[PDB]
Symmetry: C2
Subunit: 171 residues, 2 copies
């Protein structure tokens, strides 16, 4: 296939980048130690598309932790929200409200979880987190919707307060 | 209405609906709102409970859980093949100490009878009888009421008159 080397990151193909992200998240999942790492691994897996191995990992919280109810509810919701056709307006409204109130990571995660990554990328770019939005657009999304996000990122990179024309040229 | 458990099912349901409406009219604090939401979700009025769930202030510590619960109540209204894991999770929560939270979920999904026996197993006879009177067709409530009559006939309860009435 002759793919570009991974030393260029966002300049590579979608599948080649996705394979490396899968390998990295597998490495992260292998060496979890405490509760402050399992949550982050679950959050990463919930945006990398792995839905089957995240529910099982969620159903492991101890009966004494204060977040057991939240994790159980999240696992059940993820199990039962696998349908994207009907009953998606209220979920989108809740995600938008959570994003507006300040909780951005949860709203973006939920939006990418249900049916939509482009809107989550747009909200991420609106709040100034361009790197995570670009990474999200590279991982998920068809090569027809990521083009607009990358063009917007290039236009942002051409601002006089950034002066990163070389990266814009590469993208 | 003089006899609580000796009346018809529709009459009892209408009276508890009238009671919960009056309890919802005069909400004052957040704990009363939580109790009213619990009662409405246990009674089956999910449509008016979702709206009442999406009213938590953006400063309370329970906003996230209440926002996640409102979507869950809306999405799992159907009972398909993806319900076994939900029942397993509810059974684990009940066996882990929290009974009301799991009984509520079991009633919400499709299973009033399972919640009724779990309530009877843990000694909540009055609440289980109320649950059986409110929901369930007049074919499974009979077994639940006979199981309560058997308890009422024990030599430790000595409430044989109430058992005769039931």
């Amino acid at each position: 296939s002759n793919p570009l080397d991974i030393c260029y990151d966002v300049l590579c193909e979608n599948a080649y980048f996705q394979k490396f992200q899968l390998e990295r998240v597998n490495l992260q999942e292998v060496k979890r130690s405490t509760y402050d790492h399992t949550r982050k691994c679950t959050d990463q897996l919930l945006l990398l598309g792995q839905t089957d191995r995240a529910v099982q990992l969620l159903l492991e919280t101890s009966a004494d932790n204060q977040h057991y109810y939240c994790d159980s509810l999240k696992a059940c919701l993820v199990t039962t929200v696998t349908s994207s056709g009907p009953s998606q307006s209220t979920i989108k409204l809740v995600a938008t409200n959570m994003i507006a109130n300040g909780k951005l990571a949860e709203g973006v995660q939920l939006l990418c979880l249900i049916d939509k990554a482009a809107d989550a990328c747009r909200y991420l770019q609106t709040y100034g987190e361009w790197n995570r939005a670009a990474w999200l657009a590279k991982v998920r999304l068809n090569p027809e919707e990521c083009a607009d996000v990358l063009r917007r990122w290039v236009d942002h990179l051409c601002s006089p307060q950034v002066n990163q024309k070389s990266k814009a040229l590469l993208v």
